[PDB]
Design a binder for this molecule. Structure first.
Ligand SMILES: NC(=O)c1ccc(S(=O)(=O)N(Cc2ccc(C(F)(F)F)cc2)[C@H]2CNC[C@@H]2N(Cc2ccc(C(F)(F)F)cc2)S(=O)(=O)c2ccc(C(N)=O)cc2)cc1
Ligand SMILES: [Cl-]
Ligand SMILES: [Cl-]
Lengths: 99, 99
Protein backbone atom coordinates (compact mmCIF):
# COMPACT_ATOMS: atom_id res chain seq x y z
CA UNK A 1 0.00 0.00 0.00
CA UNK A 2 0.74 3.71 -0.29
CA UNK A 3 -0.82 5.42 2.72
CA UNK A 4 -1.24 9.18 2.83
CA UNK A 5 -1.41 11.04 6.14
CA UNK A 6 -4.45 13.32 5.91
CA UNK A 7 -6.08 10.94 8.41
CA UNK A 8 -4.52 8.73 11.06
CA UNK A 9 -2.87 5.69 9.41
CA UNK A 10 -5.11 3.13 11.10
CA UNK A 11 -4.92 -0.40 9.72
CA UNK A 12 -6.23 -3.82 10.66
CA UNK A 13 -3.88 -6.27 12.36
CA UNK A 14 -4.34 -9.89 13.34
CA UNK A 15 -2.86 -11.31 16.52
CA UNK A 16 -3.96 -14.32 18.52
CA UNK A 17 -6.49 -15.03 15.76
CA UNK A 18 -8.25 -11.71 16.46
CA UNK A 19 -8.61 -8.63 14.28
CA UNK A 20 -7.72 -5.28 15.84
CA UNK A 21 -7.27 -1.68 14.71
CA UNK A 22 -3.77 -0.26 15.10
CA UNK A 23 -1.86 2.90 14.21
CA UNK A 24 1.28 2.83 12.04
CA UNK A 25 3.56 5.09 14.12
CA UNK A 26 7.01 5.86 12.77
CA UNK A 27 7.76 7.82 15.97
CA UNK A 28 7.40 4.66 18.10
CA UNK A 29 10.48 2.48 18.34
CA UNK A 30 8.41 -0.43 19.60
CA UNK A 31 4.99 -2.05 19.09
CA UNK A 32 2.63 -1.45 22.03
CA UNK A 33 -0.81 -3.10 22.25
CA UNK A 34 -3.76 -2.63 24.63
CA UNK A 35 -4.20 -5.23 27.38
CA UNK A 36 -4.63 -8.69 25.88
CA UNK A 37 -3.54 -12.26 26.52
CA UNK A 38 -0.39 -13.57 24.81
CA UNK A 39 1.42 -16.88 25.16
CA UNK A 40 4.57 -17.68 27.06
CA UNK A 41 6.66 -15.66 29.44
CA UNK A 42 7.12 -11.92 29.47
CA UNK A 43 10.01 -9.67 30.51
CA UNK A 44 9.91 -6.15 31.94
CA UNK A 45 10.40 -3.10 29.78
CA UNK A 46 10.37 0.57 30.50
CA UNK A 47 9.24 2.82 27.69
CA UNK A 48 9.42 6.58 27.45
CA UNK A 49 6.40 8.35 26.02
CA UNK A 50 5.36 11.96 25.82
CA UNK A 51 4.24 12.10 29.47
CA UNK A 52 6.80 9.96 31.26
CA UNK A 53 8.30 6.43 31.40
CA UNK A 54 5.99 3.48 32.20
CA UNK A 55 6.25 -0.29 32.73
CA UNK A 56 4.95 -2.67 30.09
CA UNK A 57 5.07 -6.43 29.47
CA UNK A 58 7.45 -7.58 26.76
CA UNK A 59 6.57 -10.69 24.77
CA UNK A 60 9.07 -11.96 22.22
CA UNK A 61 8.65 -13.81 18.90
CA UNK A 62 4.92 -13.22 18.61
CA UNK A 63 3.08 -13.82 15.34
CA UNK A 64 1.28 -10.75 14.09
CA UNK A 65 -0.17 -9.84 10.69
CA UNK A 66 -0.28 -6.18 9.65
CA UNK A 67 -2.42 -5.33 6.64
CA UNK A 68 -1.97 -8.89 5.53
CA UNK A 69 1.82 -8.84 5.85
CA UNK A 70 3.16 -11.45 8.25
CA UNK A 71 5.59 -10.49 11.00
CA UNK A 72 7.05 -12.30 14.05
CA UNK A 73 8.61 -10.06 16.65
CA UNK A 74 8.44 -8.33 20.00
CA UNK A 75 5.09 -7.00 21.22
CA UNK A 76 4.71 -4.85 24.34
CA UNK A 77 1.45 -4.85 26.24
CA UNK A 78 0.39 -1.94 28.42
CA UNK A 79 -1.73 1.21 28.80
CA UNK A 80 -1.44 2.81 25.42
CA UNK A 81 -3.84 5.37 23.90
CA UNK A 82 -4.25 3.11 20.86
CA UNK A 83 -2.62 -0.07 19.55
CA UNK A 84 0.65 1.09 17.98
CA UNK A 85 2.75 -0.63 15.32
CA UNK A 86 6.24 0.84 15.70
CA UNK A 87 9.50 0.56 13.80
CA UNK A 88 10.45 -2.93 15.00
CA UNK A 89 7.57 -4.38 12.96
CA UNK A 90 7.27 -1.64 10.30
CA UNK A 91 10.82 -2.63 9.28
CA UNK A 92 9.78 -6.27 9.01
CA UNK A 93 6.94 -5.53 6.61
CA UNK A 94 9.22 -3.33 4.52
CA UNK A 95 7.64 0.02 5.33
CA UNK A 96 9.39 3.26 4.38
CA UNK A 97 8.57 6.95 4.43
CA UNK A 98 8.71 8.63 1.02
CA UNK A 99 8.41 12.24 -0.19
CA UNK B 1 13.84 10.74 -0.43
CA UNK B 2 13.08 7.19 0.75
CA UNK B 3 13.61 6.97 4.46
CA UNK B 4 14.30 3.63 6.15
CA UNK B 5 12.84 2.75 9.54
CA UNK B 6 15.79 0.74 10.73
CA UNK B 7 16.66 3.88 12.71
CA UNK B 8 14.54 6.71 13.93
CA UNK B 9 13.59 8.87 10.93
CA UNK B 10 15.42 11.97 12.05
CA UNK B 11 15.78 14.99 9.74
CA UNK B 12 16.93 18.57 9.90
CA UNK B 13 14.35 21.32 9.97
CA UNK B 14 14.55 25.11 9.99
CA UNK B 15 12.05 27.12 12.01
CA UNK B 16 12.27 30.63 13.40
CA UNK B 17 15.82 30.91 12.08
CA UNK B 18 16.91 27.88 14.09
CA UNK B 19 18.18 24.54 12.70
CA UNK B 20 16.75 21.61 14.68
CA UNK B 21 16.68 17.80 14.51
CA UNK B 22 13.19 16.31 14.42
CA UNK B 23 11.47 12.93 14.16
CA UNK B 24 9.11 12.27 11.21
CA UNK B 25 6.19 10.83 13.20
CA UNK B 26 3.12 9.38 11.52
CA UNK B 27 1.47 8.68 14.89
CA UNK B 28 1.43 12.40 15.83
CA UNK B 29 -1.58 14.36 14.56
CA UNK B 30 0.24 17.64 15.00
CA UNK B 31 3.89 18.81 15.13
CA UNK B 32 5.38 19.27 18.61
CA UNK B 33 8.67 21.10 19.27
CA UNK B 34 10.76 21.67 22.38
CA UNK B 35 10.45 25.03 24.13
CA UNK B 36 11.12 27.94 21.80
CA UNK B 37 9.80 31.33 20.86
CA UNK B 38 7.41 31.71 17.92
CA UNK B 39 5.63 34.75 16.56
CA UNK B 40 1.94 35.36 16.73
CA UNK B 41 -1.00 34.44 18.90
CA UNK B 42 -1.24 31.09 20.67
CA UNK B 43 -3.63 29.06 22.77
CA UNK B 44 -3.09 26.33 25.32
CA UNK B 45 -3.66 22.70 24.58
CA UNK B 46 -3.03 19.31 26.21
CA UNK B 47 -1.58 16.40 24.32
CA UNK B 48 -1.06 12.91 25.64
CA UNK B 49 0.13 9.36 25.20
CA UNK B 50 2.12 6.86 27.15
CA UNK B 51 3.03 8.37 30.48
CA UNK B 52 0.24 10.93 30.45
CA UNK B 53 -0.35 14.43 29.12
CA UNK B 54 1.64 17.61 28.78
CA UNK B 55 0.53 21.22 28.29
CA UNK B 56 1.70 22.90 25.10
CA UNK B 57 1.20 26.25 23.35
CA UNK B 58 -0.51 26.05 19.95
CA UNK B 59 0.71 28.39 17.23
CA UNK B 60 -0.99 28.36 13.82
CA UNK B 61 0.25 29.27 10.35
CA UNK B 62 3.95 28.74 11.12
CA UNK B 63 6.55 28.19 8.38
CA UNK B 64 8.87 25.20 8.69
CA UNK B 65 11.41 23.97 6.17
CA UNK B 66 11.77 20.17 6.23
CA UNK B 67 14.44 18.71 3.96
CA UNK B 68 14.24 21.70 1.67
CA UNK B 69 10.49 21.49 1.60
CA UNK B 70 8.65 24.54 2.92
CA UNK B 71 5.45 23.69 4.77
CA UNK B 72 2.97 25.86 6.67
CA UNK B 73 0.83 24.73 9.62
CA UNK B 74 0.24 24.42 13.36
CA UNK B 75 3.17 23.92 15.67
CA UNK B 76 2.71 22.91 19.30
CA UNK B 77 5.47 23.98 21.69
CA UNK B 78 6.24 22.42 25.07
CA UNK B 79 8.17 19.93 27.15
CA UNK B 80 8.46 17.12 24.65
CA UNK B 81 11.53 14.86 24.93
CA UNK B 82 12.10 15.00 21.14
CA UNK B 83 11.09 17.38 18.32
CA UNK B 84 8.23 15.78 16.37
CA UNK B 85 7.01 16.53 12.80
CA UNK B 86 3.40 15.34 12.79
CA UNK B 87 0.93 14.50 10.08
CA UNK B 88 -0.26 18.10 9.76
CA UNK B 89 3.06 19.02 8.14
CA UNK B 90 4.03 15.61 6.67
CA UNK B 91 1.01 15.90 4.37
CA UNK B 92 2.26 19.24 3.05
CA UNK B 93 5.57 17.81 1.90
CA UNK B 94 3.80 14.84 0.23
CA UNK B 95 5.05 12.25 2.71
CA UNK B 96 3.55 8.75 2.52
CA UNK B 97 3.99 5.34 4.16
CA UNK B 98 4.86 2.59 1.64
CA UNK B 99 5.11 -1.21 1.93
N1 LIG C 1 -2.71 14.98 19.62
C1 LIG C 1 -1.53 15.18 18.98
O1 LIG C 1 -1.42 15.93 18.02
C2 LIG C 1 -0.34 14.44 19.51
C3 LIG C 1 -0.46 13.49 20.53
C4 LIG C 1 0.66 12.83 21.05
C5 LIG C 1 1.91 13.19 20.52
S1 LIG C 1 3.31 12.39 21.16
O2 LIG C 1 4.25 13.45 21.48
O3 LIG C 1 2.82 11.51 22.23
N2 LIG C 1 4.06 11.41 19.98
C6 LIG C 1 5.36 11.82 19.43
C7 LIG C 1 6.51 11.22 20.28
C8 LIG C 1 6.59 11.37 21.66
C9 LIG C 1 7.66 10.83 22.39
C10 LIG C 1 8.64 10.07 21.75
C11 LIG C 1 9.83 9.49 22.52
F1 LIG C 1 9.86 8.13 22.41
F2 LIG C 1 10.96 10.04 22.02
F3 LIG C 1 9.72 9.71 23.86
C12 LIG C 1 8.58 9.90 20.35
C13 LIG C 1 7.50 10.44 19.64
C14 LIG C 1 3.35 10.14 19.71
C15 LIG C 1 3.37 9.76 18.22
N3 LIG C 1 4.55 8.86 18.03
C16 LIG C 1 4.86 8.21 19.29
C17 LIG C 1 4.14 8.98 20.41
N4 LIG C 1 3.29 8.08 21.16
C18 LIG C 1 2.20 7.31 20.60
C19 LIG C 1 0.85 7.95 20.46
C20 LIG C 1 0.34 8.90 21.34
C21 LIG C 1 -0.93 9.41 21.15
C22 LIG C 1 -1.69 9.01 20.04
C23 LIG C 1 -3.11 9.55 19.77
F4 LIG C 1 -3.77 8.89 18.81
F5 LIG C 1 -3.77 9.41 20.98
F6 LIG C 1 -3.06 10.88 19.48
C24 LIG C 1 -1.17 8.09 19.15
C25 LIG C 1 0.11 7.59 19.33
S2 LIG C 1 3.72 7.72 22.73
O4 LIG C 1 4.39 8.84 23.36
O5 LIG C 1 2.57 7.12 23.38
C26 LIG C 1 4.92 6.43 22.48
C27 LIG C 1 4.46 5.13 22.25
C28 LIG C 1 5.38 4.09 22.04
C29 LIG C 1 6.73 4.39 22.10
C30 LIG C 1 7.73 3.26 21.83
N5 LIG C 1 8.94 3.23 22.38
O6 LIG C 1 7.39 2.35 21.08
C31 LIG C 1 7.18 5.69 22.30
C32 LIG C 1 6.28 6.76 22.53
C33 LIG C 1 2.05 14.09 19.46
C34 LIG C 1 0.92 14.75 18.98
CL1 LIG D 1 11.06 -7.26 17.04
CL1 LIG E 1 -1.73 13.80 -1.23
Amino acid sequence: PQITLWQRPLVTIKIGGQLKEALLDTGADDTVLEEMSLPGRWKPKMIGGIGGFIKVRQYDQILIEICGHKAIGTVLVGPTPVNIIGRNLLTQIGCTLNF
